[PDB]
């Protein structure tokens, strides 16, 4: 089939975690799959980014209350006709 073929014919953005999980299930006897679980949890988070979303929600929740805002090397936004202006 078209298992892990990308838009450009290469590999998906989550092919490595899936191939790791299929290594896990290839060497695992059935009903011993409970040791195989962490590769799976890594794969589902590669697909949907759920734990990353919850973590960035908590970081933004602590960030958004403060009156100081930001004391860090900032992230500067530019317009598209000025990528390499300066």
């Amino acid at each position: 089939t078209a298992a892990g073929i990308s838009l450009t014919g290469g590999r998906n953005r989550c092919f490595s975690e899936w191939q790791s999980f299929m290594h896990c299930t290839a060497k695992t006897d059935a009903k011993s799959r409970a040791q195989c679980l962490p590769n799976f949890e890594d794969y589902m988070e590669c697909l949907h980014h759920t734990k990353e979303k919850a973590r960035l929600r908590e970081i933004e929740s602590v960030l958004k209350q403060k009156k100081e805002g930001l004391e860090a090397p900032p992230v500067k936004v530019i317009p598209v006709k000025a990528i390499g202006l300066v």
């Binding site: 078209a2 298992a3 892990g4 073929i5 990308s6 450009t8 014919g9 290469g10 590999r11 998906n12 092919f15 490595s16 975690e17 899936w18 191939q19 790791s20 299929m22 290594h23 299930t25 290839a26 006897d29 059935a30 009903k31």
Partner: protein, 59 residues
């Protein structure tokens, strides 16, 4: 000469009973990937989609 011809039939039925218990245990027994799916190509491992492929994708 009749108790013996009963022992024969009761052995012939206990054999069928043990035959059933076996063949009902042999169903629920888990099966290899090479018996259950594609006999050759026995690995589940992909290497799927190799034209624009990147070194460091295996794990």
């Amino acid at each position: 000469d009749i108790l013996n011809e009963e022992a024969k039939i009761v052995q012939a039925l206990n054999n069928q009973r043990e035959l059933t218990i076996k063949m009902h245990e042999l169903k629920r027994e888990e099966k290899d990937y090479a018996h259950s799916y594609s006999p050759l190509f026995s690995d589940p491992v992909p290497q799927g989609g190799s034209i624009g492929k990147a070194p460091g994708s295996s794990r």
